[PDB]
């Protein structure tokens, strides 16, 4: 009944809040699946520059068993659900290593203003390309500027610049 969109085969992806909810179906949910829950970890960044919640509430839940809406049907599953706007920071950074991540846009310019992006890295031998994507993120984060805390573990790929 609901509308979902799964992105796989994607080392790197970018999408505005609108880029994931076109059918206008209140309660539509976007999905991301890990290429290999053993040798790939998931790191996501969303620019709360725009209050997606302000236009429409937005949460994120992880899940190991394929579910477009049921996994959220009983949202009481409360699998680390994270309101993606209650961010007392300009940038929200989350990391996840389960098998499936889900973003739920539910009704209780800007569409092209907010922005979502995700990256997967070989926790053994990361790619210089993904490595510098991690690089840009870490830099912009330690600022966002309180250069105090941006714990985006990058073991096996410290930045060629400002790192080490």
């Amino acid at each position: 009944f609901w509308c979902s969109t799964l992105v796989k085969g994607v080392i790197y992806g970018s999408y505005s809040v609108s880029e994931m909810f076109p059918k206008n179906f209140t309660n539509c949910t976007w999905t991301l699946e890990n290429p290999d829950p053993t040798k790939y970890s998931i790191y996501l960044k969303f620019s709360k520059k725009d209050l997606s919640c302000s236009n429409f509430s937005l949460l994120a839940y992880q899940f190991d068993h394929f579910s477009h809406e049921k996994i959220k049907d009983l949202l009481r599953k409360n699998h680390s659900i994270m309101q993606l706007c209650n961010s007392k920071n300009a940038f929200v950074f989350l990391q996840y290593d389960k098998n499936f991540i889900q973003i739920r846009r539910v009704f209780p310019e800007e569409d092209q203003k907010s922005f979502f992006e995700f990256l997967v890295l070989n926790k053994v031998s990361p790619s210089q390309f993904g490595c510098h994507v991690l690089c840009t993120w870490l830099e912009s984060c330690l600022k966002s500027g309180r250069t105090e805390s941006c714990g985006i573990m990058y073991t096996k790929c410290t930045c060629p610049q400002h790192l080490g």
């Binding site: 699946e33 290999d36 829950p37 053993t38 190991d64 068993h65 394929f66 098998n99």
Partner: protein, 132 residues
């Protein structure tokens, strides 16, 4: 003459004292194994060879018990242990004489199995050898 062979990889993460239910069926001749049932029903009496590998979940637990069982009596067992929450297989392979109407399936004696979606890390594969 009789052509019976099956091979299915596990698809969802199973934990606790439940029967494993391999769903990613890759090859299924004769259609005797139902991925949904997660079990192999013998209809052609004879001798069969059943080999299974089950992956321990990483980061959780230390011990994993996978025990193949035909009907209600366990006929094989396998243990995987790693203190620092690594990945270690709990595999085994058994030749069994299955008469008509027998059921065989991998039962999970505690622990948490991996939840490979399509990589087919955990596998279950069997085939007949002789007809009675």
């Amino acid at each position: 003459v009789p052509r019976v062979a099956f091979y299915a990889g596990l698809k969802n993460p199973h934990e606790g004292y439940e029967v494993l239910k391999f769903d990613d069926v890759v090859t299924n001749l004769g259609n005797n194994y139902d991925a949904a049932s997660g079990k192999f029903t013998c209809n052609i009496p004879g001798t069969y060879f059943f080999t299974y590998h089950v992956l321990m979940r990483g980061g959780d637990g230390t011990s994993m018990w996978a025990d193949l069982c035909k009907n209600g009596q366990v006929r094989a067992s396998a243990i995987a242990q790693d203190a620092d929450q690594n990945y270690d297989y709990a595999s085994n392979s058994v030749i069994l004489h299955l008469d008509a109407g027998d059921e065989v399936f991998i039962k999970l004696d505690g622990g948490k199995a991996h939840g490979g979606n399509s990589n087919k890390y955990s596998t279950f594969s069997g085939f007949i050898i002789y007809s009675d």
